[PDB]
Design an enzyme around this catalytic site. Structure first.
Site, PDB file in Angstrom:
ATOM      1  N   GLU A 199     -93.109 -86.275  74.144  1.00 41.63           N
ATOM      2  CA  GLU A 199     -92.479 -87.577  74.294  1.00 41.63           C
ATOM      3  C   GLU A 199     -92.871 -88.536  73.171  1.00 41.63           C
ATOM      4  OE1 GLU A 199     -92.791 -89.151  78.268  1.00 41.63           O
ATOM      5  OE2 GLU A 199     -91.643 -87.469  79.121  1.00 41.63           O
ATOM      6  N   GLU A 257     -90.343 -80.726  81.629  1.00 41.92           N
ATOM      7  CA  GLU A 257     -90.683 -81.564  82.768  1.00 41.92           C
ATOM      8  C   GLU A 257     -89.399 -81.925  83.504  1.00 41.92           C
ATOM      9  OE1 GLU A 257     -93.026 -85.104  81.844  1.00 41.92           O
ATOM     10  OE2 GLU A 257     -94.308 -83.940  80.488  1.00 41.92           O
TER      11      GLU A 257
END
Ligand code: CL
Lengths: 460, 452
Positions: free
Chosen positions: B162, B360
């Site tokens: 991220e 995720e």
């Protein structure tokens, strides 16, 4: 070992209703001599409303009211809550009365009564004459008298047929959204002005209640407040609540609820909140003192309380907050509407119990409750609004439970009879049990219309 | 069907689970620093203990085997290996990851390692962190040490988790460590992360190391409110909402997969004095010079955004967010499995062919342990079931999806939200460190068996 107890019934004469407001449905914004309101002004300026929507036509109800009353009769409403547009009566706010404006409300009220539907009138649902805003609007103390003269004209005209009168709808919004956030007309952005407006609204309310009581006019007068029950995230998480968190979240909830409930029902503003605002330089001490004395001097208890209930708030203490209290809002998991509001019928029950336990005995009407979903019309002309039905069913049952627990609830008005102009959100939020196709002005009864029709039949 | 060998997994991150924050010579990280200051984390929570996984990893791997995971995604704490960021290597830190990786392999679970999941050595932040160009070299040396140590057993490596969050939440919003608040610095960080990623990919390919290297991006598919309402979309709205979406998505996807930043976005940022003209030029040149295509793309998907054009907005783009009716989690995130399907199709349509892993996906619900020791997390089950089905549909429509990691194996420290958000399929009682399998654990156990 316990003989069956019957279900709690809604009381005989319970006002099953639906609600609208003038600017949101009427259209005909400049017709028959109607004056410009602050909402005409606001929506005719750029960058105030989503998509540049305006209420120029709205649901065209000024023209189509007979069809709408026919739909109310079909539905089996006991009552219909609507607002009178001040600018149809006094285009400049005061002075020469506009006969054509009186003739419209004459026709509407007569049609409702002809059809056995009890009219319930909101005197002020946000559409101040622009000519009065030009001299300061609700911030100008003379507003109280202009409002009073308007209110008493219409009360005296219609008191034979209209027995329940609401002075103001949602003064929180009038003051804070109109004069602090500036997201509602008239678009002003000054907290101290907003608190001046709060006080003008309270004095205006009392002046009408006083005239009705002192002159022994045989009508009931109340006020409609949007109330938001507040819950602590810390308690949802199972943690211990600090003293400071309880205090700050409490003060934040006083701005929503007690700031208006306390003057109306107890004859004082919530002193801890005024103190907080003075201490933070958000309210002048001199004004806090005078507003408290003037409410004490002018207080008169009303005949009923109107509550608008849609959702709750979950809050927590946060020193980093930019809000006027050090709080942030949290996001409990669950179902949410197109407004981003949690579906939380427990909050209606909790709120009604809290009113019963915290304030003097008074008849309560739920003057608005409803939900916005992104309705689609099927090929065969239906709207299968199953989530709106579930919302209403659950809130109706919360109201029944409140009655079972001794709350003096005397009516329930669904927001709204029809999809309409939702203020700064334009036509993008549909709250109706009747769908309005804005291209054609066709009314299409949603499944929720038929659900409510049957619910009324079973609960009256 | 899911392809043979599809990597059904679960994911964690080091700071969120490990604890043992100052044990065995481990260095201070920026998250140790950040959680040790007031008013950064809800309720003053910190990761000092977390799920105590550094001590309890054997139990946790046993639960993974019981679950029947094919793979386990975790991050390595840089500060356990190089306490000062560079220089002295810490043998006790290596020993921990040796033991963990050996235990995963012994149990037939494929280890998938995130090299950087936000826990920069504080000693490196002290010299400017990700804004210091030399960070690329410090990261590179750390990354290559651990790749070379574990490449016999770890065949899938993620350079960064991220980068949107590392850069913008850490250096613009300042709500994540290191708490800096400067948009131009955040853009320097974006570029540092991209160069860091390419240097590792290049070394693996140039030295012919037989592992796969990728990167994990959180991606947010954007939808127009105007289209939800059935209205005509203006060109300006389409333009501005598109720019806003490029900050979320293309800003990271384009350099990683195409070897350029999205020019329209850089041009807009320059026009708005959020990026210097000379930096926009040098950024593009340096990504072009250093670009190398990776072995796979990791996607973190949780929800969509619904946006509309609004000149009144306080955001860096003139947009606001809308709130469609529906189900929302404790994060305030819409449950929107269609978004996972649409996103995957868009990646297939818009970028060169590449294997994709969902690194995720999961949901936060306010879990209660019942008096009979269960967690009846029926909404988490429904969330997972619908997203698994979206992934299946993507595969059926030709997307090269090769695995799916549930966030998270266990409830853990959710960054600035502290322990108030529980994403696990295993509940962690932080008072006792007891692991309690939620109903979602058994749902997933059964799903894996039925889809492998
Ligand atoms: Cl009279």
């Amino acid at each position: 070992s316990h003989m069956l107890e019957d279900p709690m019934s809604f009381p005989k004469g319970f006002l099953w209703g639906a609600a609208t407001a003038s600017y949101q449905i009427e259209g005909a914004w400049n017709e028959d001599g109607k004056g410009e309101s602050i909402w005409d002004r606001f929506t005719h300026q750029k960058r105030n409303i989503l998509y540049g929507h305006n209420g120029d036509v709205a649901c065209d109800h000024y023209h189509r009211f007979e069809e709408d009353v026919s739909l109310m009769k079909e539905l089996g409403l006991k009552a219909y809550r609507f607002s009178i547009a001040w600018t149809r009566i006094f285009p400049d706010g005061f002075g020469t009365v506009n006969q054509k404006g009186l003739e419209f409300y004459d026709r509407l009220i007569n049609k409702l009564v002809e059809n056995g539907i009890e009219p319930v009138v909101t005197l002020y649902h946000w559409d101040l004459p622009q000519k009065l805003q030009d001299i300061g609007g609700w911030a100008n103390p003379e507003i109280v008298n202009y409002y009073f003269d308007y209110a008493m004209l219409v009360i005296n005209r219609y008191k034979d047929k209209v027995k329940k009168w609401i002075t103001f709808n949602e003064p929180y919004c009038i003051a804070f959204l109109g004069y602090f956030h500036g997201i509602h007309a008239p678009g002003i952005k000054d907290f101290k002005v907003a608190m001046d407006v709060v006080h003008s609204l309270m004095l205006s309310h009392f002046k009408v209640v006083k005239a009705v009581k002192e002159n022994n006019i045989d009508v009931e007068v109340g006020i409609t407040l949007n109330l938001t029950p507040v819950y602590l995230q810390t308690e949802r998480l199972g943690y211990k609540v600090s003293e400071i968190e309880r205090e700050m979240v409490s003060l934040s909830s006083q701005l929503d609820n007690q700031l208006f409930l306390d003057p109306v029902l107890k004859g004082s503003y919530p002193q801890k909140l005024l103190d907080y605002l003075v201490q933070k330089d958000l309210l002048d001490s001199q004004k806090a003192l005078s507003m408290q004395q003037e409410v004490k001097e002018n207080f008169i208890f009303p005949d009923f309380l109107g509550i608008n209930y849609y959702t709750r708030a979950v809050r927590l203490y946060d020193e980093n907050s930019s809000w006027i209290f050090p709080i942030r809002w949290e996001h409990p998991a669950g179902e949410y509407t197109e407004m981003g509001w949690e579906v939380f019928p427990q909050g209606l029950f909790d709120l009604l119990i809290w009113i019963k336990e915290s304030y003097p005995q008074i008849p309560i009407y739920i003057t608005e409750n409803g939900a916005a979903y992104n309705d689609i019309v099927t090929e065969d002309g239906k709207v299968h609004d199953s989530k709106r039905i579930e919302y209403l069913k659950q809130h109706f049952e919360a109201a029944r439970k409140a009655i079972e627990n001794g709350v003096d609830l005397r009516g329930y008005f669904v927001w709204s009879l029809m999809d309409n102009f939702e203020w700064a959100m334009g036509y993008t939020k549909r709250f109706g049990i009747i769908y309005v196709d804005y291209e054609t002005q066709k009314r299409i009864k949603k499944d929720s219309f038929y659900f409510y029709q049957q619910y009324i039949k079973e609960n009256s």
